[PDB]
């Protein structure tokens, strides 16, 4: 009992490591694949189930399925399998030796929290654990006490206004739009270009393509016009088979779905509009502080130029009499994990944990009252 | 078998063997056999007297007194017609087949007699559902504890019906396995659309059972199924009754099946362990 | 797939002419099965299901389980090795992605068309599968007009006959002045 482990069950990726380290010791995607063919050879009875980078490597003969969908778990067996894999094969640390820290998106069903707590306390018999929010850990990592969080993850995008020493639970907005919808739209448009991708392996391929050759556009109409003069924007990517794919307008089209959800057919508003509404719902005095500080985190906000576009849109919507500043740290991918590690390292938090004795005597409902 | 059946195939088989040779003259085939089924109830088939032209079937229901007090006049004419006679064995319902009269149907009668236990059990649940359907003042709640030390309670109020289950596990080995089994019963709902709510409680008995002298203790869990007319109408009544009655043996059988499954998995892993060991012997 | 299975029976067909022959055979002697396992069991008692077809050369080919095996590939794409779902699953997913209120209307009306949906019993199997997947509290109806082969052509003719459509056409003048990209914006 010297340190604690912080695990972030990201909608598309899993981050884990020791409390105190500045970088995670285990970064693998949440994939639980199973064989799709029959199998003929006799010298191998191997691993009916596959997880982790192994699944990514041999994805061509497996039906990859994401255990977590838009922030809510759908298959508990897959999640338990991934937990076991991360705890034993990668970390090689017994659950009893150290406690575990878990994080989840806001406005999630209580059933998921109760089931997760029960499984953690019963199966792995962890000495203690806790449940927190990714946005607050982002604040802790950023070393600030006031601001607005843009936690645009792979599965969920949400904002949580905060003020010095307190939060505003009544001004929390959660949007289902996230990286998965962007990937689906990218596949649909790549079909309109002439390239077809259906199965999950090509889903990973398109995910990589978007990760490598996508960016946001300051002006949509101007970019479309310059695309009409398509002689300096098209770029080529090399597929595993050697085929070359040329991508033009699709580079700056899919990211615009964030600001224009109507493309996918969702009757909602963009991230800028949702943040403006959330800040407006707050008290007048704290609006200045919230404008002066705007923290963003998540893997969906690494597109170059996103900060500039958000700043321009907010300034256009907001009155043109004050200053709006966007802060874009270059390590926002692991901000949640860093915040969790820092929070665990805090001396005052050594008593806020939830132990087996109190959990057993009280019941699973205790976590509900533990910091909401 | 996955859903435990309700038709005892013993009676079906013996009646089929008897009737397939029925049209063979003066063939008595004196029969006297004693059986047993779930819920700790004993059956008995035996001719009333030296006259072998009549075959009788009887039951030894544990909670028979509650059934007699309630009154099952509905069951005396709807499913069973004129071939039901006063109890003989132990003051429990007993029927007989009149072979001298021509038996026209062959499968329908056998199937009707096969579900005797559930046929008699339904006399209370269906009547409570009728009470809440008919608009009659909500009949007084009742508690029906069968042979098992556990207890069953039902409340029939307006706009809905309720049922609660008390669970008792005898051997220390299966207590934890059953607890795990029932822990996930209250949550599995992602594959059911028109299904009732399910909850589990063991430490705090429900407030309904405080006054009732039902199963009360420490190592006893509770399961409640909320009932609504959408799954308790005249169409989906028999299925629900069969599912609830066969709940206990269903849990038991699937617990044993899980035990066999884990046995098979460990047996499979032993082969991998032996393969790893074999690295020590020389070429 | 039918050619591949006909190979497993003992009859070989490779070139395109035999491709047309097998296409005709499927068009004439294929049907869907309400229950796959029950049909396979009844095939184990192969004395009432086998049928004979006359080839151009006069050779007679006896077809048994292949009649109801190939159509099942539509509901079980895994037979060909495609990591996808059947038509029932895709339609269920498409309807679910729609708004809640319009789901009732979509369930109440299910039009089908094309030359691949003339197999007898396909409508019944689709209805059974959809009702099993969908909640068992409403009514699902399948409409199977007996002239679905030319439904597209009839619809095109009716649309052309519409008076309001006489102006939506694309003429040479506007096409030349604008360019080929005009059709892209014309009703998507």
């Amino acid at each position: 009992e010297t340190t604690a482990l912080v695990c972030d069950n990201g909608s598309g990726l899993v981050k884990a490591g020791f409390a105190g380290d500045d970088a995670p010791r285990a970064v693998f995607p949440s994939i639980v694949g199973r064989p799709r063919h029959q199998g003929v050879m006799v010298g191998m009875g191997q691993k009916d189930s596959y997880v982790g980078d192994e699944a990514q490597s041999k994805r061509g003969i497996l039906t990859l399925k994401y255990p977590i969908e838009h922030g809510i778990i759908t298959n508990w067996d897959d999640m338990e399998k991934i937990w076991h894999h991360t705890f034993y094969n990668e970390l090689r640390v017994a659950p009893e030796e150290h406690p575990t820290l878990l994080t989840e998106a806001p406005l999630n069903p209580k059933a998921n929290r109760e089931k997760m707590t029960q499984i953690m306390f019963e199966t792995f018999n962890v000495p203690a654990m806790y449940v927190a929010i990714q946005a607050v850990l982002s604040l802790y990592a950023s070393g600030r006490t006031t601001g607005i969080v843009l936690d645009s993850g792979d599965g969920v995008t949400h904002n949580v206004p905060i003020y010095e020493g307190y939060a505003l639970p009544h001004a929390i907005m959660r949007l289902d739009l996230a990286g998965r919808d962007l990937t689906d739209y990218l596949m649909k448009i790549l079909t309109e270009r002439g390239y077809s991708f259906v199965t999950t392996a090509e889903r990973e391929i398109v995910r990589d393509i978007k990760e490598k050759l996508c960016y946001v556009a300051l002006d949509f109409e101007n970019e479309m016009a310059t695309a009409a003069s398509s002689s300096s924007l098209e770029k080529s990517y090399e597929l595993p088979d050697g085929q070359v794919i040329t991508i033009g307008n699709e580079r700056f089209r899919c990211p615009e779905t964030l600001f224009q959800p109507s493309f996918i057919g969702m009757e909602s508003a963009g991230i800028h509009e949702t943040t403006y509404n959330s800040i407006m719902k707050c008290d007048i005095d704290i609006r200045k502080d919230l404008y002066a500080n705007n923290v963003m985190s998540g893997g969906t906000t690494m597109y170059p130029g996103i900060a500039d576009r958000m700043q321009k849109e907010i300034t256009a919507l907001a009155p043109s009499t004050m200053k709006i500043k966007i802060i874009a740290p270059p390590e926002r991918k692991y901000s949640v994990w860093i915040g969790g590690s820092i929070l665990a390292s805090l001396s005052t938090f050594q008593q806020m944990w939830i132990t087996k004795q109190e959990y057993d005597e009280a019941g699973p409902s205790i976590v509900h009252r533990k910091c909401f | 078998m996955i859903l435990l059946e309700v038709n005892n195939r013993i009676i079906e088989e013996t009646l089929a063997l008897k009737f397939e040779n029925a049209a063979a003259g003066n063939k008595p085939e004196a029969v006297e056999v004693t059986f047993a089924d779930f819920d700790g109830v004993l059956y008995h088939i035996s001719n009333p007297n030296g006259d072998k032209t009549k075959v009788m079937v009887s039951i030894s229901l544990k909670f028979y007194k509650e059934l007699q007090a309630h009154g099952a006049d509905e069951l005396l004419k709807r499913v069973y017609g004129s071939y039901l006679v006063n109890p003989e064995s132990g003051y429990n319902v007993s029927l007989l087949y009149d072979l001298e009269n021509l038996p026209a149907s062959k499968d329908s009668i056998v199937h009707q007699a096969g579900m005797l236990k559930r046929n008699c059990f339904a006399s209370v649940f269906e009547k409570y559902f009728q009470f809440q359907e008919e608009g009659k003042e909500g009949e007084n709640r009742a508690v029906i504890h069968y042979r098992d030390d556990e207890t069953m309670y039902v409340e029939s109020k307006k706009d809905r019906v309720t049922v609660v289950f008390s669970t008792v596990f005898k051997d220390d080995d299966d207590v934890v396995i059953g607890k795990v089994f029932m822990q996930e019963f209250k949550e599995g709902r992602r594959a059911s659309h028109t299904a009732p709510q399910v909850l589990f409680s063991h430490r705090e008995p429900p407030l309904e059972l405080k006054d009732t002298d039902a199963a009360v203790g420490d190592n006893i869990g509770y399961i409640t199924f909320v009932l609504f007319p959408r799954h308790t109408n005249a169409s989906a009544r028999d299925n629900t009754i069969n599912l609830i009655h066969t709940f206990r043996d269903y849990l038991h059988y699937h617990i044993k099946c899980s035990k066999a499954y884990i046995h098979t998995r460990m047996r499979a892993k032993t082969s991998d362990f032996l393969k790893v060991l074999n690295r020590a012997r020389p070429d | 797939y039918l050619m591949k299975i006909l190979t497993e029976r003992g009859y070989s067909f490779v070139t395109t002419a035999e491709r047309e022959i097998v296409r005709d055979i499927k068009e004439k002697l294929c049907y869907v099965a309400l229950d796959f396992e029950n049909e396979m069991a009844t095939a184990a008692s192969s004395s009432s299901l086998e049928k004979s077809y006359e080839l151009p050369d006069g050779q007679v080919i006896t077809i048994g389980n292949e009649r109801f095996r190939c159509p099942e590939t539509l509901f079980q794409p895994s037979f060909i090795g495609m990591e996808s779902a059947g038509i029932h699953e895709t339609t269920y997913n498409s309807i679910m992605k729609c708004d809640i209120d319009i789901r009732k209307d979509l369930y109440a009306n299910n039009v089908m068309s094309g030359g691949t949906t003339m197999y007898p019993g396909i409508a019944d199997r689709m209805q059974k599968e959809i009702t099993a997947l969908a909640p068992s509290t409403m009514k699902i109806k399948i409409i199977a007009p007996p002239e679905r082969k030319y439904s597209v052509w009839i619809g095109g003719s009716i649309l052309a006959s519409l008076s309001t459509f006489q102006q939506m056409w694309i003429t040479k003048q506007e096409y030349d002045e604008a360019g080929p990209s005009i059709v892209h914006r014309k009703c998507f």
Partner: peptide, 7 residues
Amino acid sequence: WXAXCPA
């Protein structure tokens, strides 16, 4: 989800 959206 259970109602609305899939999850």
